[PDB]
Protein backbone atom coordinates (compact mmCIF):
# COMPACT_ATOMS: atom_id res chain seq x y z
CA UNK A 1 0.00 0.00 0.00
CA UNK A 2 0.89 3.75 -0.09
CA UNK A 3 0.11 6.96 1.85
CA UNK A 4 -1.70 10.23 1.02
CA UNK A 5 -0.53 13.13 3.25
CA UNK A 6 -2.21 16.44 3.91
CA UNK A 7 0.13 18.85 5.63
CA UNK A 8 -1.54 21.51 7.85
CA UNK A 9 0.44 24.61 8.75
CA UNK A 10 -2.21 27.21 8.35
CA UNK A 11 -5.55 26.08 6.91
CA UNK A 12 -6.37 24.49 10.26
CA UNK A 13 -9.86 23.40 9.21
CA UNK A 14 -11.86 20.90 7.19
CA UNK A 15 -14.18 23.40 5.42
CA UNK A 16 -13.07 25.06 2.15
CA UNK A 17 -9.78 23.23 2.13
CA UNK A 18 -9.03 22.17 -1.48
CA UNK A 19 -5.72 20.59 -0.40
CA UNK A 20 -7.31 18.31 2.24
CA UNK A 21 -10.42 17.74 0.14
CA UNK A 22 -8.30 16.41 -2.76
CA UNK A 23 -6.53 13.84 -0.50
CA UNK A 24 -9.95 12.69 0.74
CA UNK A 25 -11.74 12.47 -2.64
CA UNK A 26 -8.69 10.52 -3.92
CA UNK A 27 -8.69 7.85 -1.19
CA UNK A 28 -12.46 7.39 -1.58
CA UNK A 29 -12.42 7.07 -5.39
CA UNK A 30 -9.83 4.29 -4.94
CA UNK A 31 -10.75 2.36 -1.72
CA UNK A 32 -8.24 -0.02 -0.17
CA UNK A 33 -5.48 1.63 -2.23
CA UNK A 34 -4.35 4.33 0.19
CA UNK A 35 -3.64 5.28 3.82
CA UNK A 36 -4.44 8.89 4.92
CA UNK A 37 -2.24 10.85 7.29
CA UNK A 38 -3.36 14.48 7.92
CA UNK A 39 -0.35 15.87 9.74
CA UNK A 40 0.75 18.93 11.59
CA UNK A 41 4.48 19.27 12.22
CA UNK A 42 5.37 20.84 15.55
CA UNK A 43 8.46 22.64 14.26
CA UNK A 44 11.10 23.67 16.86
CA UNK A 45 12.34 25.87 13.98
CA UNK A 46 9.68 28.61 14.18
CA UNK A 47 10.46 29.27 17.88
CA UNK A 48 13.78 30.70 16.56
CA UNK A 49 11.96 32.75 13.91
CA UNK A 50 8.99 34.00 15.95
CA UNK A 51 8.08 34.85 19.56
CA UNK A 52 4.97 32.98 20.80
CA UNK A 53 3.07 33.98 23.96
CA UNK A 54 1.16 31.66 26.33
CA UNK A 55 -2.23 32.80 24.98
CA UNK A 56 -1.31 31.92 21.42
CA UNK A 57 0.05 28.52 22.45
CA UNK A 58 -3.26 27.76 24.14
CA UNK A 59 -5.14 28.85 21.03
CA UNK A 60 -3.01 26.55 18.91
CA UNK A 61 -3.49 23.75 21.46
CA UNK A 62 -7.25 24.22 21.32
CA UNK A 63 -7.00 24.50 17.54
CA UNK A 64 -5.19 21.21 17.13
CA UNK A 65 -7.58 19.44 19.51
CA UNK A 66 -10.57 20.68 17.55
CA UNK A 67 -8.93 19.50 14.29
CA UNK A 68 -8.34 16.07 15.81
CA UNK A 69 -11.98 15.81 16.84
CA UNK A 70 -13.06 17.07 13.44
CA UNK A 71 -11.00 14.52 11.53
CA UNK A 72 -12.19 11.61 13.69
CA UNK A 73 -15.74 12.34 12.52
CA UNK A 74 -14.41 11.67 9.00
CA UNK A 75 -12.84 8.30 10.01
CA UNK A 76 -9.42 9.85 10.34
CA UNK A 77 -7.30 11.60 12.94
CA UNK A 78 -4.66 14.31 13.13
CA UNK A 79 -1.04 13.20 13.26
CA UNK A 80 1.04 15.63 15.22
CA UNK A 81 4.66 14.91 14.34
CA UNK A 82 7.40 16.57 16.42
CA UNK A 83 10.64 17.65 14.71
CA UNK A 84 12.02 19.87 11.94
CA UNK A 85 10.38 19.40 8.47
CA UNK A 86 13.84 18.81 6.89
CA UNK A 87 14.33 15.82 9.20
CA UNK A 88 10.69 14.72 9.24
CA UNK A 89 9.87 14.42 5.55
CA UNK A 90 12.77 12.14 4.40
CA UNK A 91 11.71 9.74 7.15
CA UNK A 92 7.93 9.68 6.61
CA UNK A 93 8.19 9.72 2.80
CA UNK A 94 10.02 6.37 3.00
CA UNK A 95 8.60 5.01 6.26
CA UNK A 96 5.03 5.73 4.97
CA UNK A 97 5.46 5.17 1.21
CA UNK A 98 4.04 8.61 0.57
CA UNK A 99 2.53 8.98 -2.91
CA UNK A 100 1.00 12.47 -2.51
CA UNK A 101 1.61 15.52 -0.33
CA UNK A 102 -0.90 18.41 -0.35
CA UNK A 103 -0.80 21.68 1.55
CA UNK A 104 -2.10 25.25 1.43
CA UNK A 105 0.55 27.69 0.19
CA UNK A 106 1.84 30.54 2.30
CA UNK A 107 3.73 33.70 1.35
CA UNK A 108 5.70 34.17 4.61
CA UNK A 109 9.46 34.01 3.86
CA UNK A 110 10.01 31.17 6.34
CA UNK A 111 7.18 29.18 4.74
CA UNK A 112 8.49 29.89 1.24
CA UNK A 113 12.00 28.52 1.93
CA UNK A 114 10.69 25.58 4.02
CA UNK A 115 8.14 24.78 1.25
CA UNK A 116 10.74 24.94 -1.55
CA UNK A 117 13.05 22.67 0.53
CA UNK A 118 10.22 20.20 0.93
CA UNK A 119 9.22 20.42 -2.75
CA UNK A 120 12.83 19.57 -3.68
CA UNK A 121 12.90 16.51 -1.38
CA UNK A 122 9.50 15.45 -2.69
CA UNK A 123 10.68 15.52 -6.32
CA UNK A 124 13.78 13.45 -5.38
CA UNK A 125 11.66 10.73 -3.75
CA UNK A 126 9.09 10.86 -6.57
CA UNK A 127 6.37 12.26 -4.27
CA UNK A 128 3.52 14.11 -5.99
CA UNK A 129 3.07 17.58 -4.50
CA UNK A 130 -0.08 19.62 -5.09
CA UNK A 131 -0.49 23.00 -3.44
CA UNK A 132 -3.53 25.24 -3.08
CA UNK A 133 -3.96 28.95 -2.52
CA UNK A 134 -6.85 29.08 -0.10
CA UNK A 135 -5.50 31.20 2.79
CA UNK A 136 -6.41 34.39 0.93
CA UNK A 137 -9.39 35.02 -1.32
CA UNK A 138 -7.07 36.03 -4.12
CA UNK A 139 -3.73 34.69 -5.19
CA UNK A 140 -1.18 37.53 -4.51
CA UNK A 141 0.82 36.16 -7.43
CA UNK A 142 -2.15 36.74 -9.81
CA UNK A 143 -2.82 40.19 -8.36
CA UNK A 144 0.81 41.09 -8.87
CA UNK A 145 0.89 39.76 -12.46
CA UNK A 146 -2.33 41.60 -13.32
CA UNK A 147 -0.57 44.75 -12.13
CA UNK A 148 2.38 44.09 -14.47
CA UNK A 149 4.83 42.83 -11.90
CA UNK A 150 4.44 45.24 -8.97
CA UNK A 151 2.09 45.02 -6.00
CA UNK A 152 -0.40 47.94 -5.96
CA UNK A 153 0.52 50.25 -3.07
CA UNK A 154 -2.92 51.68 -2.48
CA UNK A 155 -6.09 49.98 -1.35
CA UNK A 156 -8.09 51.50 -4.23
CA UNK A 157 -5.65 50.32 -6.91
CA UNK A 158 -5.74 46.94 -5.22
CA UNK A 159 -9.52 46.90 -5.42
CA UNK A 160 -9.41 47.86 -9.13
CA UNK A 161 -7.30 44.76 -9.81
CA UNK A 162 -9.15 42.20 -7.68
CA UNK A 163 -12.53 43.26 -9.03
CA UNK A 164 -11.62 41.85 -12.46
CA UNK A 165 -10.56 38.55 -10.82
CA UNK A 166 -12.37 35.22 -10.50
CA UNK A 167 -13.73 34.60 -7.01
CA UNK A 168 -12.86 30.89 -6.29
CA UNK A 169 -15.47 28.26 -5.56
CA UNK A 170 -15.80 27.61 -1.83
CA UNK A 171 -15.57 23.94 -0.88
CA UNK A 172 -17.49 22.20 1.87
CA UNK A 173 -16.14 19.59 4.22
CA UNK A 174 -14.54 16.44 2.69
CA UNK A 175 -16.57 13.25 2.37
CA UNK A 176 -16.07 10.82 5.31
CA UNK A 177 -13.39 8.21 4.61
CA UNK A 178 -15.11 5.03 3.35
CA UNK A 179 -13.68 1.85 4.88
CA UNK A 180 -10.20 2.99 5.85
CA UNK A 181 -7.99 0.97 8.23
CA UNK A 182 -5.99 3.00 10.73
CA UNK A 183 -2.46 3.31 9.20
CA UNK A 184 -0.16 0.63 10.69
CA UNK A 185 2.20 1.91 13.39
CA UNK A 186 5.48 3.29 11.99
CA UNK A 187 8.95 3.11 13.58
CA UNK A 188 8.07 5.97 15.94
CA UNK A 189 4.47 5.02 16.66
CA UNK A 190 5.73 1.56 17.66
CA UNK A 191 8.03 2.78 20.43
CA UNK A 192 5.27 5.22 21.53
CA UNK A 193 1.64 4.88 20.53
CA UNK A 194 0.93 8.46 21.65
CA UNK A 195 3.81 10.14 19.82
CA UNK A 196 1.61 11.67 17.10
CA UNK A 197 -1.15 12.76 19.52
CA UNK A 198 -2.31 16.37 19.95
CA UNK A 199 -0.19 18.27 22.52
CA UNK A 200 -1.76 18.88 25.91
CA UNK A 201 -1.87 22.34 27.46
CA UNK A 202 1.14 21.24 29.55
CA UNK A 203 3.32 20.20 26.59
CA UNK A 204 2.70 23.40 24.59
CA UNK A 205 2.25 26.14 27.18
CA UNK A 206 5.51 26.29 29.12
CA UNK A 207 4.45 29.40 31.08
CA UNK A 208 0.90 28.65 32.41
CA UNK A 209 1.03 31.74 34.61
CA UNK A 210 0.86 34.01 31.59
CA UNK A 211 -2.53 32.65 30.44
CA UNK A 212 -5.25 35.25 30.62
CA UNK A 213 -9.01 34.65 30.40
CA UNK A 214 -10.03 31.92 28.02
CA UNK A 215 -12.34 34.07 25.85
CA UNK A 216 -11.66 32.98 22.23
CA UNK A 217 -11.32 29.19 22.12
CA UNK A 218 -9.24 28.05 19.13
CA UNK A 219 -10.48 25.76 16.35
CA UNK A 220 -12.63 25.62 13.22
CA UNK A 221 -15.68 24.67 15.30
CA UNK A 222 -15.55 27.89 17.31
CA UNK A 223 -14.59 29.96 14.26
CA UNK A 224 -17.72 28.73 12.48
CA UNK A 225 -19.80 29.36 15.58
CA UNK A 226 -18.37 32.84 16.03
CA UNK A 227 -18.88 33.67 12.37
CA UNK A 228 -22.52 32.45 12.57
CA UNK A 229 -23.04 34.63 15.63
CA UNK A 230 -21.58 37.73 13.89
CA UNK A 231 -23.76 37.31 10.79
CA UNK A 232 -26.94 36.93 12.86
CA UNK A 233 -27.42 40.72 12.91
CA UNK A 234 -27.62 41.44 9.20
CA UNK A 235 -28.13 45.13 9.71
CA UNK A 236 -24.98 45.39 11.82
CA UNK A 237 -23.19 43.38 9.16
CA UNK A 238 -24.53 45.33 6.18
CA UNK A 239 -24.03 48.76 7.72
CA UNK A 240 -20.66 48.07 9.42
CA UNK A 241 -18.18 50.95 9.30
CA UNK A 242 -14.80 49.99 10.83
CA UNK A 243 -13.82 53.60 11.84
CA UNK A 244 -17.08 53.94 13.80
CA UNK A 245 -16.51 50.87 15.95
CA UNK A 246 -15.31 51.63 19.51
CA UNK A 247 -11.75 50.58 20.51
CA UNK A 248 -12.57 50.64 24.20
CA UNK A 249 -16.06 49.21 24.56
CA UNK A 250 -15.89 46.37 27.11
CA UNK A 251 -17.24 43.85 24.60
CA UNK A 252 -15.42 43.78 21.21
CA UNK A 253 -17.09 46.11 18.73
CA UNK A 254 -15.86 44.04 15.75
CA UNK A 255 -16.03 40.32 14.95
CA UNK A 256 -12.83 39.00 16.64
CA UNK A 257 -12.53 36.53 13.79
CA UNK A 258 -8.93 37.65 13.27
CA UNK A 259 -7.25 34.79 15.25
CA UNK A 260 -9.42 32.29 13.34
CA UNK A 261 -8.53 33.78 9.96
CA UNK A 262 -4.88 33.91 11.03
CA UNK A 263 -4.72 30.17 11.60
CA UNK A 264 -7.05 29.25 8.76
CA UNK A 265 -9.64 27.96 11.20
CA UNK A 266 -12.11 30.08 9.23
CA UNK A 267 -11.80 30.26 5.46
CA UNK A 268 -11.55 33.90 4.34
CA UNK A 269 -13.25 32.68 1.18
CA UNK A 270 -16.30 31.30 3.07
CA UNK A 271 -16.45 34.46 5.16
CA UNK A 272 -16.34 36.63 2.05
CA UNK A 273 -19.05 34.51 0.49
CA UNK A 274 -21.34 34.69 3.53
CA UNK A 275 -20.84 38.46 3.57
CA UNK A 276 -21.68 38.74 -0.15
CA UNK A 277 -25.01 36.92 0.58
CA UNK A 278 -25.94 39.42 3.30
CA UNK A 279 -25.06 42.39 1.08
CA UNK A 280 -27.27 41.15 -1.84
CA UNK A 281 -30.10 40.91 0.73
CA UNK A 282 -29.47 44.29 2.38
CA UNK A 283 -29.75 47.20 -0.10
CA UNK A 284 -28.57 49.78 2.42
CA UNK A 285 -24.99 48.73 3.08
CA UNK A 286 -21.50 50.09 3.52
CA UNK A 287 -18.82 49.90 0.85
CA UNK A 288 -15.03 49.22 1.08
CA UNK A 289 -12.94 50.26 2.76
CA UNK A 290 -15.01 50.76 5.90
CA UNK A 291 -17.32 47.77 5.21
CA UNK A 292 -16.82 44.27 6.57
CA UNK A 293 -15.85 42.99 3.10
CA UNK A 294 -13.52 45.99 3.13
CA UNK A 295 -11.77 44.57 6.23
CA UNK A 296 -11.22 41.30 4.44
CA UNK A 297 -9.77 43.26 1.50
CA UNK A 298 -7.30 44.96 3.83
CA UNK A 299 -6.17 41.47 4.67
CA UNK A 300 -5.86 40.70 0.96
CA UNK A 301 -4.05 43.98 0.33
CA UNK A 302 -1.35 43.39 2.96
CA UNK A 303 -0.88 39.78 1.82
CA UNK A 304 -0.30 41.06 -1.72
CA UNK A 305 2.28 43.68 -0.82
CA UNK A 306 3.95 41.31 1.65
CA UNK A 307 4.19 38.54 -0.95
CA UNK A 308 6.45 40.76 -3.06
CA UNK A 309 8.85 41.78 -0.25
CA UNK A 310 10.79 39.12 1.80
CA UNK A 311 11.96 41.83 4.22
CA UNK A 312 8.41 43.11 4.79
CA UNK A 313 8.83 42.93 8.60
CA UNK A 314 11.95 45.07 8.82
CA UNK A 315 12.79 48.63 7.92
CA UNK A 316 16.13 47.84 6.19
CA UNK A 317 15.91 46.32 2.70
CA UNK A 318 12.16 46.82 2.48
CA UNK A 319 11.26 48.54 -0.81
CA UNK A 320 8.10 50.03 0.71
CA UNK A 321 9.53 51.28 3.95
CA UNK A 322 10.69 54.82 4.70
CA UNK A 323 14.11 54.80 6.42
CA UNK A 324 13.60 56.52 9.74
CA UNK A 325 16.23 57.15 12.50
CA UNK A 326 14.18 55.57 15.28
CA UNK A 327 15.81 55.75 18.65
CA UNK A 328 16.76 53.19 21.22
CA UNK A 329 15.09 53.83 24.54
CA UNK A 330 14.95 50.48 26.43
CA UNK A 331 13.23 51.96 29.49
CA UNK A 332 10.48 53.54 27.41
CA UNK A 333 10.14 50.31 25.45
CA UNK A 334 9.80 48.17 28.62
CA UNK A 335 7.29 50.64 30.08
CA UNK A 336 5.23 50.52 26.86
CA UNK A 337 5.55 46.77 26.64
CA UNK A 338 4.08 46.30 30.08
CA UNK A 339 1.52 49.11 30.03
CA UNK A 340 3.38 51.27 32.56
CA UNK A 341 3.61 54.38 30.39
CA UNK A 342 1.56 56.41 32.83
CA UNK A 343 -1.01 57.08 30.09
CA UNK A 344 -4.07 55.12 31.35
CA UNK A 345 -5.63 54.72 27.94
CA UNK A 346 -2.40 53.29 26.53
CA UNK A 347 -1.75 51.21 29.66
CA UNK A 348 -5.27 49.72 29.51
CA UNK A 349 -4.76 48.70 25.90
CA UNK A 350 -1.32 47.22 26.57
CA UNK A 351 -2.79 45.37 29.54
CA UNK A 352 -5.81 44.04 27.67
CA UNK A 353 -3.45 42.84 24.98
CA UNK A 354 -1.12 41.04 27.35
CA UNK A 355 -4.02 39.48 29.28
CA UNK A 356 -6.44 38.62 26.51
CA UNK A 357 -4.35 38.62 23.34
CA UNK A 358 -6.80 40.70 21.31
CA UNK A 359 -7.43 44.44 21.16
CA UNK A 360 -9.51 46.46 18.75
CA UNK A 361 -7.98 47.85 15.57
CA UNK A 362 -8.11 51.49 16.75
CA UNK A 363 -6.71 50.40 20.11
CA UNK A 364 -3.78 49.03 18.10
CA UNK A 365 -3.64 52.41 16.30
CA UNK A 366 -3.44 54.22 19.62
CA UNK A 367 -0.61 52.13 21.10
CA UNK A 368 1.32 51.81 17.85
CA UNK A 369 1.17 55.56 17.26
CA UNK A 370 2.31 56.19 20.82
CA UNK A 371 5.31 53.84 20.52
CA UNK A 372 6.50 55.10 17.15
CA UNK A 373 5.97 58.47 15.51
CA UNK A 374 3.50 59.78 18.15
CA UNK A 375 5.46 59.70 21.40
CA UNK A 376 8.39 57.32 22.12
CA UNK A 377 10.01 57.47 18.66
CA UNK A 378 10.74 53.74 18.89
CA UNK A 379 11.04 51.57 15.79
CA UNK A 380 7.81 49.94 14.63
CA UNK A 381 9.92 46.74 14.53
CA UNK A 382 9.92 46.71 18.35
CA UNK A 383 6.17 47.23 18.47
CA UNK A 384 5.81 44.46 15.89
CA UNK A 385 7.84 42.14 18.12
CA UNK A 386 5.60 42.70 21.16
CA UNK A 387 2.43 42.32 19.09
CA UNK A 388 3.88 39.16 17.61
CA UNK A 389 4.35 37.74 21.10
CA UNK A 390 0.99 38.84 22.46
CA UNK A 391 -1.66 38.80 19.72
CA UNK A 392 -3.72 35.69 19.10
CA UNK A 393 -4.12 36.93 15.52
CA UNK A 394 -0.48 37.79 14.95
CA UNK A 395 0.10 37.59 11.28
CA UNK A 396 3.39 38.28 9.63
CA UNK A 397 1.95 40.26 6.74
CA UNK A 398 -0.87 42.01 8.64
CA UNK A 399 1.28 42.92 11.65
CA UNK A 400 4.10 44.35 9.58
CA UNK A 401 1.78 46.16 7.13
CA UNK A 402 -0.21 47.89 9.84
CA UNK A 403 2.89 48.84 11.78
CA UNK A 404 4.39 50.47 8.74
CA UNK A 405 1.06 52.19 8.15
CA UNK A 406 0.77 53.48 11.73
CA UNK A 407 4.36 54.67 11.98
CA UNK A 408 3.91 56.50 8.64
CA UNK A 409 6.74 54.39 7.19
CA UNK A 410 4.60 53.09 4.29
CA UNK A 411 1.13 53.48 2.68
CA UNK A 412 0.24 56.26 5.08
CA UNK A 413 2.10 59.56 4.87
CA UNK A 414 0.02 62.01 6.94
CA UNK A 415 2.28 61.81 9.96
CA UNK A 416 1.03 65.16 11.31
CA UNK A 417 -2.21 63.52 12.43
CA UNK A 418 -1.29 62.13 15.83
CA UNK A 419 -3.59 60.28 18.21
CA UNK A 420 -3.85 61.87 21.62
CA UNK A 421 -3.26 59.22 24.36
CA UNK A 422 -5.52 61.48 26.41
CA UNK A 423 -8.36 62.51 24.09
CA UNK A 424 -8.65 59.58 21.74
CA UNK A 425 -10.32 57.14 24.15
CA UNK A 426 -12.65 59.85 25.47
CA UNK A 427 -14.79 60.07 22.32
CA UNK A 428 -16.04 56.49 22.85
CA UNK A 429 -15.58 55.86 26.58
CA UNK A 430 -16.20 59.20 28.41
CA UNK A 431 -16.64 57.50 31.82
CA UNK A 432 -13.43 55.52 31.31
CA UNK A 433 -15.01 52.12 31.99
CA UNK A 434 -12.39 50.49 29.81
CA UNK A 435 -9.62 52.07 31.91
CA UNK A 436 -11.28 51.10 35.18
CA UNK A 437 -11.33 47.46 33.95
CA UNK A 438 -7.74 47.13 32.78
CA UNK A 439 -6.10 49.65 35.09
CA UNK A 440 -8.11 48.95 38.31
CA UNK A 441 -5.65 50.86 40.49
CA UNK A 442 -7.23 53.97 38.92
CA UNK A 443 -10.81 52.71 39.39
CA UNK A 444 -11.77 55.29 42.05
CA UNK A 445 -10.87 58.24 39.81
CA UNK A 446 -13.80 60.36 38.51
CA UNK A 447 -14.22 60.51 34.72
CA UNK A 448 -13.06 64.13 34.96
CA UNK A 449 -9.47 62.97 35.31
CA UNK A 450 -9.30 59.17 34.86
CA UNK A 451 -7.58 59.72 31.50
CA UNK A 452 -5.30 62.26 33.11
CA UNK A 453 -4.69 61.19 36.73
CA UNK A 454 -1.86 63.75 37.07
CA UNK A 455 -4.60 66.39 37.08
CA UNK A 456 -5.80 65.18 40.49
CA UNK A 457 -4.25 66.91 43.49
CA UNK A 458 -2.01 64.81 45.70
CA UNK A 459 -4.62 64.64 48.40
CA UNK A 460 -7.31 63.46 45.96
CA UNK A 461 -4.83 60.83 44.77
CA UNK A 462 -4.54 59.65 48.38
CA UNK A 463 -8.36 59.73 48.53
CA UNK A 464 -8.66 57.59 45.36
CA UNK A 465 -6.17 55.23 46.88
CA UNK A 466 -3.76 55.43 43.96
CA UNK A 467 -0.88 57.89 44.27
CA UNK A 468 1.01 58.69 41.09
CA UNK A 469 4.57 57.43 41.25
CA UNK A 470 3.92 54.68 43.80
CA UNK A 471 0.70 52.91 42.74
CA UNK A 472 0.65 54.04 39.13
CA UNK A 473 3.58 55.48 37.19
CA UNK A 474 4.07 59.07 36.22
CA UNK A 475 3.91 59.67 32.48
CA UNK A 476 7.15 58.42 30.94
CA UNK A 477 6.96 61.35 28.44
CA UNK A 478 4.89 64.50 28.02
CA UNK A 479 2.72 63.98 24.91
CA UNK A 480 2.33 67.76 24.35
CA UNK A 481 6.08 68.13 24.06
CA UNK A 482 7.31 64.96 22.36
CA UNK A 483 4.65 64.75 19.67
CA UNK A 484 5.52 68.22 18.34
CA UNK A 485 9.19 67.15 18.34
CA UNK A 486 8.43 63.88 16.54
CA UNK A 487 6.54 65.61 13.74
CA UNK A 488 9.62 67.70 13.08
CA UNK A 489 11.76 64.55 13.23
CA UNK A 490 9.38 62.77 10.86
CA UNK A 491 9.45 65.81 8.56
CA UNK A 492 13.28 65.56 8.39
CA UNK A 493 13.25 61.81 7.72
CA UNK A 494 10.70 62.27 4.91
CA UNK A 495 13.00 64.89 3.33
CA UNK A 496 16.17 62.78 3.37
CA UNK A 497 14.14 59.87 1.94
CA UNK A 498 12.68 62.15 -0.77
CA UNK A 499 16.25 62.98 -1.88
CA UNK A 500 17.42 59.39 -2.61
C1 LIG B 1 -0.27 47.93 14.63
C2 LIG B 1 -1.29 46.95 14.08
C3 LIG B 1 -1.00 45.60 14.06
C4 LIG B 1 -1.92 44.67 13.55
N1 LIG B 1 -1.56 43.35 13.57
C5 LIG B 1 -2.41 42.48 13.12
C6 LIG B 1 -2.07 41.09 13.17
O1 LIG B 1 -1.00 40.69 13.61
N2 LIG B 1 -3.01 40.18 12.74
C7 LIG B 1 -4.21 40.60 12.25
O2 LIG B 1 -4.99 39.73 11.86
N3 LIG B 1 -4.53 41.90 12.11
C8 LIG B 1 -3.69 42.81 12.55
N4 LIG B 1 -4.04 44.16 12.51
C9 LIG B 1 -5.27 44.60 11.81
C10 LIG B 1 -6.52 44.80 12.59
O3 LIG B 1 -6.20 45.64 13.70
C11 LIG B 1 -7.04 43.44 13.04
O4 LIG B 1 -7.13 42.54 11.95
C12 LIG B 1 -8.41 43.50 13.69
O5 LIG B 1 -8.33 44.31 14.86
C13 LIG B 1 -8.87 42.12 14.04
O6 LIG B 1 -10.13 42.27 14.73
P1 LIG B 1 -11.46 41.73 14.04
O7 LIG B 1 -11.23 40.35 13.54
O8 LIG B 1 -12.53 42.03 15.05
O9 LIG B 1 -11.62 42.70 12.78
P2 LIG B 1 -12.92 43.05 11.92
O10 LIG B 1 -13.08 44.52 11.96
O11 LIG B 1 -14.06 42.17 12.34
O12 LIG B 1 -12.37 42.57 10.49
C14 LIG B 1 -12.60 41.23 10.02
C15 LIG B 1 -11.30 40.64 9.53
O13 LIG B 1 -10.75 41.46 8.47
C16 LIG B 1 -9.34 41.51 8.57
N5 LIG B 1 -8.95 42.87 8.89
C17 LIG B 1 -9.61 43.82 9.65
N6 LIG B 1 -8.91 44.92 9.77
C18 LIG B 1 -7.74 44.69 9.07
C19 LIG B 1 -6.58 45.47 8.81
N7 LIG B 1 -6.37 46.71 9.27
N8 LIG B 1 -5.60 44.88 8.09
C20 LIG B 1 -5.77 43.64 7.64
N9 LIG B 1 -6.81 42.83 7.79
C21 LIG B 1 -7.76 43.43 8.52
C22 LIG B 1 -8.94 40.59 9.71
O14 LIG B 1 -8.72 39.29 9.22
C23 LIG B 1 -10.20 40.60 10.58
O15 LIG B 1 -10.38 39.35 11.21
C24 LIG B 1 -3.15 45.10 13.02
C25 LIG B 1 -3.45 46.47 13.04
C26 LIG B 1 -2.58 47.39 13.57
C27 LIG B 1 -2.97 48.85 13.54
Numbering used by the authors: 5 to 504
Please give the exact wording used by the authors of the publication that reports this structure.
Here, we report a serial X-ray crystallographic snapshot of the photoexcited (6-4) photolyase from Drosophila melanogaster (Dm(6-4)photolyase) in the semiquinone radical pair state. We employed synchrotron-based serial millisecond crystallography at beamline X06SA at the Swiss Light Source, with microcrystals of Dm(6-4) photolyase supplied to the X-ray beam in hydroxyethylcellulose using a high viscosity extruder. In the dark, Asn403 has hydrogen bonds to water 55, Gln398 and to Trp407, which is the first tryptophan in the tetrad. After illumination and reduction of FAD the side chain of Asn403 moves into close hydrogen bonding distance (2.2 Å) to the N5 of FAD˙−. The data establishes that Asn403 actively stabilizes the negative charge on FAD˙− by donating a hydrogen bond to its N5. In the dark structure, the carboxyl group and indole functional group of Trp381 are within hydrogen bond distance to the amino group of Gln331 and the backbone C = O of Pro329, respectively. In the light structure the indole group of Trp381 rotates about 34° towards the solvent. The solvent-accessible surface for Trp381 increases from 2.1 Å in dark to 51 Å in light, as estimated by AREAIMOL (ccp4i). We do not observe a residue or localized water molecules nearby the final tryptophan that might act as proton acceptor and we find that the tryptophan swings outwards towards the solvent. Therefore, we conclude that it is the solvent that extracts the proton from the final and fourth tryptophan.
